[PDB]
Design a protein around this ligand. Structure first.
Ligand SMILES: CC(=O)N[C@H]1[C@H](O[C@@H]2[C@H](O[C@]3(C(=O)O)C[C@H](O)[C@@H](NC(C)=O)[C@H]([C@H](O)[C@H](O)CO)O3)[C@@H](O)[C@H](O[C@H]3[C@H](O)[C@@H](O)[C@H](O)O[C@@H]3CO)O[C@@H]2CO)O[C@H](CO)[C@H](O)[C@@H]1O[C@@H]1O[C@H](CO)[C@H](O)[C@H](O)[C@H]1O
Lengths: 122, 293
């Protein structure tokens, strides 16, 4: 009932060195790179000559000063990258107000997607 | 460059996690260079055995400063240095064909670098600078630091690739991502040092081309050196990286004046703050010798 090598994952690796072959009931653990959020079980186990589902590494988000300027917003406080699940709080630049269709000023990074709010001239 | 002018590079390493590498450096690269340029018979083939022993001693002493993470610092209780760990990887990689290097040490250090110290845009970051800033050559007090340190670490990763690729499968993606970052910002670089080091890093991946390749070449002074105002040792280092880039490109037309300039420096390594100059000039000239017709 042996397994072969554990699968690769993007932006991460296992915490041990990989082997050609693994005994049944063996397990290995994954770790994501810095600021990438591990989704799923970190541990996978060898059952019936098959590994359990490996995890994913959810992307963080880049915060763009260019987009902020384009959308007439700024950071409320003062961090160029945001974890999945972590939030960023913006404010309208002075003389501008939230657009009618605009996302909220407080916005959350999910797996590489960040929705910026947009403010328009008063 | 004649073995007798370089005999002083054979030395007993001592001191803690940084100084030990300061000492290991000249011996490692001296042996590498003398091997390639086959100078041992003249100089004294007896002496190679003693040199290899000094290199093994360096390696072994360095292992006392390997932390449980696989990273390195001057002391086991000091936070690990990104730069120092990458330097150890560079040195141990070039020494794998001189002495026995435990692949778990080497590839462990590589994996730490990838999993802990790379940022999402590919940048490598230092959170615990080395104490002996003189050992880091032209990276010292460089304002283009993200690019310079990202290149340095990336070169180390590339030099470890053959050895660690299989045991560390995050390596190729990490290498690619750092390359992205370097490629995206190379055109804005101002300092020759950075241009040279990042240039070699991109050339190793075959991503120094088009305008970047042209910026790299045109940044040279008189088609034979890369140099900035300041410590001359930084320019020797820079130019050594440039030569290595040229060898990666196989641009053997451009090479001969650069080698000449480096040769005309009559730089024989070893003094204060000479760790990077010494490693890089002899690495570069050794490679030139190996590759030249
Ligand atoms: C650090 C903190 O207090 N975090 C709590 C947070 O407070 C908000 C601001 O923090 C964040 C944020 O969540 O928006 C933390 C993020 O990691 C930062 N993102 C990045 C990419 O770096 C952002 C970002 O810096 C800003 O959004 C930029 O505009 O900030 C925090 O800085 C802010 O602090 C103010 C303070 O409110 C004010 O009184 C004082 O005068 O100035 C400070 C800044 O100088 O406060 C923000 C709240 O409006 O709020 C969240 C939920 O809204 C949590 O309370 C969070 O604490 C975490 O909560 C978790 C549970 O949900 C968990 O328990 C963690 O342990 C908590 O830290």
């Amino acid at each position: 009932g042996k397994c072969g090598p554990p699968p690769p994952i993007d932006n991460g690796d296992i915490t041990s060195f990989p082997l050609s072959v693994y005994a049944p009931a063996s397990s290995v653990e994954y770790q994501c790179q810095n600021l990438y959020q591990l989704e799923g079980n970190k541990r996978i186990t060898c059952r019936n000559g098959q590994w359990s589902e490996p995890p994913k590494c959810l992307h963080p988000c880049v915060i763009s000063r260019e987009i902020m300027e384009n959308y007439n917003i700024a950071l409320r406080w003062t961090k160029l990258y945001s974890r999945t699940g972590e939030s960023v709080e913006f404010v309208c630049k002075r003389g501008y107000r939230l657009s009618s269709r605009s996302h909220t000023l407080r916005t959350t990074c999910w797996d590489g997607k960040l929705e910026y709010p947009t403010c328009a001239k008063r | 460059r004649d073995a007798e002018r370089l005999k002083h590079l054979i030395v007993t390493p001592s001191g803690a996690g940084e100084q030990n590498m300061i000492g290991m450096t000249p011996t490692v690269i001296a042996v590498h260079y003398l091997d390639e340029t086959e100078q041992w018979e003249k100089f004294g083939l007896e002496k190679r055995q003693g040199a290899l022993e000094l290199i093994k001693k360096g390696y072994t002493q360095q292992l006392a400063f390997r932390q449980p993470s696989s990273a390195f610092a001057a002391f086991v209780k000091r936070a690990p240095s990104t730069w120092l760990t990458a330097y150890v990887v560079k040195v141990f990689s070039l020494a794998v064909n001189l002495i026995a290097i435990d692949s778990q040490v080497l590839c462990g250090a590589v994996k730490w670098l990838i999993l802990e110290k790379q940022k999402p845009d590919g940048v490598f970051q230092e959170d615990a600078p080395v104490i002996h800033q003189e050992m880091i050559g032209g990276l010292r007090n460089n304002n283009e630091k993200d690019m310079a340190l990202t290149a340095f670490v990336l070169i180390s990763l590339q030099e470890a690739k053959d050895i660690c690729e299989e045991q560390v499968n995050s390596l190729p993606g990490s290498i690619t991502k750092a390359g992205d970052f370097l490629e995206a910002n190379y055109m804005n670089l101002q300092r020759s040092y950075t241009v040279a080091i990042a240039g070699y890093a991109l050339a190793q991946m075959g991503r120094l081309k088009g305008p970047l390749l042209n910026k790299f070449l045109t940044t040279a002074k008189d088609k034979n050196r890369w140099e900035d105002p300041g410590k001359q040792l930084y320019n020797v280092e820079a130019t050594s990286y440039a030569l290595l880039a040229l060898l990666q490109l196989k641009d053997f037309d451009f090479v001969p004046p650069v080698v000449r300039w480096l040769n005309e420096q009559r730089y024989y390594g070893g003094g204060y703050g000479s760790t990077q100059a010494t490693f890089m000039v002899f690495q570069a000239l050794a490679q030139y010798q190996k590759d030249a017709p």
